[PDB]
């Protein structure tokens, strides 16, 4: 995809994350588990909802009665009507079909971007307190219990607190 | 070392969509925007019943072809439903002058 | 034949009681109808590419 995340540096999605579109998987002493990110899932569901509703809303619908009212000596008008009728069907069929094809590409790129942005959100929080494994995961240079993982997931991770413990583990890896 | 991973949703959906650059792409959720279903009957249109002529043409009903049973005298309708080839048009052969325009007048 | 219903949109084959923007049923409609297309399937993606 355009943003390189979905089916890219994150290979495959998660059957085990039932409660949202994008989220986290943690792994520490206490145990592993999945958690949906609700801010970014709700935003995305807002956008896609709005997209769908606009594609339907913005259509202008008028009353029209369409029949075959011309007789056997009015074939020239009947053909004018056919050209008109057929012409609008060609227009609406092409627009609908391309509209769907084109907004289907944008919706999938939207999700790609949403996932890449979330990865970047955690990246920017953790800085060098974690190694970047490159498959969408961060290996922590410190001990990160459940309340720490929650702080990453809700955007309140305290870099300073763990900063020292982390650099002693990085210094240590330089052996 | 403890880990946190970013990832995205997956499920048991077999709903497929197309894009400009790909076809038969399976997705987690989709939305139909094409109506394909009809109830298979003739209904009122905005609260007003249609005038259904079973085996009669408009000309038969108006002039009172004796095979065109005197209608319940429905005082108002929204559209007219004629069969494709009504059996009871003019019983005595002939023509109806400006018929198509009168029919369009009597449409509603 | 008549079937004691009500629509905004009426087709020779039957009534369309719906608020979608396109339909593929019959062109010779009477009412506030969806736009008629020669299409079997118009489906918008809302979720993401599914795994595997």
């Amino acid at each position, epitope marked *: 995809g355009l943003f390189g995340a979905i089916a890219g540096f994150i290979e495959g999605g998660w059957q085990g994350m039932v409660d949202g579109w994008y989220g986290y998987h943690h792994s520490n002493e206490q145990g592993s588990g999945y958690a949906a990110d609700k801010e970014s899932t709700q935003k995305a569901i807002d956008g896609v*909802t709005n997209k769908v509703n606009s594609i339907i809303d913005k259509m202008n619908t008028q009353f029209e009665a369409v029949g075959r009212e011309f007789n056997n000596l009015e074939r020239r008008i009947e053909n004018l009507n056919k050209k008109m009728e057929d012409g609008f069907l060609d227009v609406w069929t092409y627009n609908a079909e391309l509209l769907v094809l084109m907004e289907n590409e944008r919706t999938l790129d939207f999700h790609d971007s949403n996932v890449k942005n979330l990865y970047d959100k955690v990246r920017l929080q953790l800085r060098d307190n974690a190694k970047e494994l490159g498959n969408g995961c961060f290996e922590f240079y410190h001990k990160c219990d459940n309340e720490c993982m929650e702080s990453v997931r809700n955007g309140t991770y305290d870099y300073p607190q763990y900063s020292e413990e982390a650099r002693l583990k990085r210094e240590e890896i330089s052996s | 070392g403890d880990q946190i991973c970013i990832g995205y949703h997956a499920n048991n959906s077999t709903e497929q969509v197309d894009t400009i650059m790909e076809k038969n792409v399976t997705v987690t*959720h989709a*939305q139909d925007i094409l109506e394909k279903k009809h109830n298979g009957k003739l209904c009122d249109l905005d609260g007003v019943k249609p005038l259904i002529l079973r085996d009669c043409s408009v000309a038969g009903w108006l002039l009172g072809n004796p095979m065109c049973d005197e209608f319940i005298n429905v005082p108002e309708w929204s559209y007219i439903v004629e069969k494709a080839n009504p059996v009871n048009d003019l019983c005595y052969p002939g023509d109806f002058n400006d018929y198509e325009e009168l029919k369009h007048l009597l449409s509603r | 034949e008549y079937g004691n219903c009500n629509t905004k949109c009426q087709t020779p084959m039957g009534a369309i009681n719906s608020s979608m923007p396109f339909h593929n049923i019959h062109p010779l409609t009477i009412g506030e109808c969806p736009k008629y297309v020669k299409s079997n399937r118009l489906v918008l993606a809302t979720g993401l590419r599914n795994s595997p």
Partner: antibody
Amino acid sequence: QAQLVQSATEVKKPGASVKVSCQASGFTFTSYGFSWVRQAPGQGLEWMGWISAYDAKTKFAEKFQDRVTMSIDTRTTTAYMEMRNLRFDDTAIYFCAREFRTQIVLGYFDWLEGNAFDMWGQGTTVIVSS
Amino acid sequence: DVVLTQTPLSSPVTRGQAASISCRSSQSLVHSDGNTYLSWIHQRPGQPPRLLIYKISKRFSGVPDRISGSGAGTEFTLTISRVEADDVGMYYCTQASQFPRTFGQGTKLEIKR
């Protein structure tokens, strides 16, 4: 806490008009829609119409289509309902009920901002009597 | 329009026993997203309604597991499985998968003594 507080009671004369307000607080106003529902003395609940706080888009009941108007003020997170040409039948309690922000909903997860009729105002009594 | 036929109108129930309210819709209530937005609300005398069940069978926050929703298609059922005084009031089935919105006639619960 998330809440809906409607306006005080209204005593009106026949022919007059009334404008009941409903103030949202504690939640994102533009994430929701609002149905107006009334309860006449001894009668069951009756839907009057709906308005999106995201869109301003309305939907109406047959019976009130003409003499009711809904509106929205996103700066005071307040929904309104105006009734023209008051009758005696209109003596009732008027509730403002929280609902969906759009007529097509993608309720793909259960905790999403949505769920229709999940939050109600305390009600506004309009009395119509000369 | 969707018609919701609620039955019975009146439901005397002895304290501790179960009550079962029925709601039939004229028509399928499946929204364009797969969800069926058939809900039950409850109104105590002198108070606003409060949501009990959404999506046929899901308990709103705060609602005891003795309150229970079921159904599919066009027949839906609220049961209240050991009734107390606080359960008295009006019960309405409601649908929000479609416009106009619809409510049932109402069911008045009452303690049978």
